[PDB]
Amino acid sequence: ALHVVLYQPEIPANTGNIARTCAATNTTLHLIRPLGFSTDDKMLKRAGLDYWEFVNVVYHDSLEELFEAYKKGKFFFITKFGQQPHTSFDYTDLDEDYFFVFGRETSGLPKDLIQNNMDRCLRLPMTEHVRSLNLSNTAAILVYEALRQQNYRDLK
Amino acid sequence: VALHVVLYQPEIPANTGNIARTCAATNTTLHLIRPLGFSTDDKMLKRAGLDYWEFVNVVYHDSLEELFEAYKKGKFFFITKFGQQPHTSFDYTDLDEDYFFVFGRETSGLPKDLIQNNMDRCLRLPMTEHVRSLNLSNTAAILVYEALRQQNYRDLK
RNA sequence: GCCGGGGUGGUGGAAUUGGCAGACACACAGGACUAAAAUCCUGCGGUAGGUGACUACCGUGCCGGUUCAAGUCCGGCCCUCGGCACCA
Numbered sequence: 458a459l460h461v462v463l464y465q466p467e468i469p470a471n472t473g474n475i476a477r478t479c480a481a482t483n484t485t486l487h488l489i490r491p492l493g494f495s496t497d498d499k500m501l502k503r504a505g506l507d508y509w510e511f512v513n514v515v516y517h518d519s520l521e522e523l524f525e526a527y528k529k530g531k532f533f534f535i536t537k538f539g540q541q542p543h544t545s546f547d548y549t550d551l552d553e554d555y556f557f558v559f560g561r562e563t564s565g566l567p568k569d570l571i572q573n574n575m576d577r578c579l580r581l582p583m584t585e586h587v588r589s590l591n592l593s594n595t596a597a598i599l600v601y602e603a604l605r606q607q608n609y610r611d612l613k
Numbered sequence: 614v615a616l617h618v619v620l621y622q623p624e625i626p627a628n629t630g631n632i633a634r635t636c637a638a639t640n641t642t643l644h645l646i647r648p649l650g651f652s653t654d655d656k657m658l659k660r661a662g663l664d665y666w667e668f669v670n671v672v673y674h675d676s677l678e679e680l681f682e683a684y685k686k687g688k689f690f691f692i693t694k695f696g697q698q699p700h701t702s703f704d705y706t707d708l709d710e711d712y713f714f715v716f717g718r719e720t721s722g723l724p725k726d727l728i729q730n731n732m733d734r735c736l737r738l739p740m741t742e743h744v745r746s747l748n749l750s751n752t753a754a755i756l757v758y759e760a761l762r763q764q765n766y767r768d769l770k
Numbered sequence: 771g772c773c774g775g776g777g778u779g780g781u782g783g784a785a786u787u788g789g790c791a792g793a794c795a796c797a798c799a800g801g802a803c804u805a806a807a808a809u810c811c812u813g814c815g816g817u818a819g820g821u822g823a824c825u826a827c828c829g830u831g832c833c834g835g836u837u838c839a840a841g842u843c844c845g846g847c848c849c850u851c852g853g854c855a856c857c858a
């Protein structure tokens with residue numbers, strides 16, 4: 458019911474951790490195929506430990522292919538640019554598929570896409586001591602915020 | 614009046630580095646219960662590229678009891694998979710109290726007897742069933758931002 | 771000065787009465803593992819033929835000798851440590 462999209466990830470271990478977090482929440486992981494690693498990177502495998510068999514991982518050769526395939530979806534885009542924190546939105550409809558899309562670790566999301574949908578742009582309130590926050594951590598804050606709103610349904 | 618993340622004998626280096634990242638992005642004081650499984654020497658801190666350590670405000674403690682007796686009136690929430698309550702069932706809004714979030718060991722976990730005595734404040738992030746545990750990094754960050762959700766991201770841009 | 775130890779890979783270092791030199795540990799390297807500076811598995815003296823299987827070759831401070839065979843025994847020398855002597 459929940460989805461995590463990774464636009465061309467770079468760090469294998471970051472993605473592997475997110476896969477484990479997905480298996481702990483029964484979340485679908487989406488990957489935009491211009492990846493910075495291979496499918497056989499051993500750091501990818503390690504970060505996912507043994508939980509890989511419980512992750513439904515979907516590959517998409519482009520951001521477009523994903524959007525069209527999941528035409529009925531609440532696509533939430535997570536960048537520094539959004540003027541609204543992630544907790545100011547609503548994820549409480551359980552009859553829906555919620556999509557959280559994460560940019561490249563050293564780039565962002567496509568600047569065209571951010572322009573068109575700034576109402577769905579979630580910025581995690583930080584300080585100035587760091588420029589960003591680890592993707593695998595940032596992915597988890599949103600899954601367990603949305604899971605709070607859905608009252609961790611079926612999850613004990 | 615801020616949040617406090619204390620890590621009981623952390624071992625895997627990368628987890629603690631990512632926790633310090635979140636701690637610097639939230640101005641959350643990081644308490645470190647020794648023995649640690651790594652080295653926080655400035656040489657090794659810079660070998661891992663941890664340039665935010667200066668802003669993390671790390672308070673090394675040598676025992677869990679030392680930490681309890683230095684911050685006696687801290688609200689100590691112990692975070693383990695053996696809790697029965699979520700992390701969102703408690704109130705971290707009081708800006709007059711010091712809230713402390715205790716995390717465990719990546720290969721072992723929090724002291725079992727400490728969990729038994731204080732099951733009232735034992736928080737379990739709801740997982741599936743086939744997943745034994747979450748990442749220490751992820752578990753810490755989730756808790757920091759849930760308290761900041763309740764604290765409306767005080768002085769956070 | 772005498773006597774007695776030590777010298778051996780990248781490192782500390784092992785090798786019994788002469789009979790496969792480098793055990794073992796650290797380093798390193800490749801992996802595995804219930805995000806490793808944890809742990810576990812594997813490789814590791816050199817050379818060249820080598821895809822490799824591996825092979826032969828060389829290698830214990832220098833130079834000798836005894837041996838079928840010398841890290842090992844013998845003689846000279848270099849370096850080093852210790853006891854003893856040596857000190858107007």
Ligand SMILES: Nc1ncnc2c1ncn2[C@@H]1O[C@H](C[C@@H](N)CC[C@H](N)C(=O)O)[C@@H](O)[C@H]1O
Pocket residue numbers: 692693694695715716717718719720721722723736737738739740745746747748749752
């Ligand atoms: N589901 C979870 N709920 C709460 N804390 C967790 C969870 N998974 C991991 N943690 C944190 O990470 C620590 C270590 C675990 N990752 C490892 C398994 C260990 N047996 C345990 O006590 O959970 C825990 O002691 C917590 O600090």
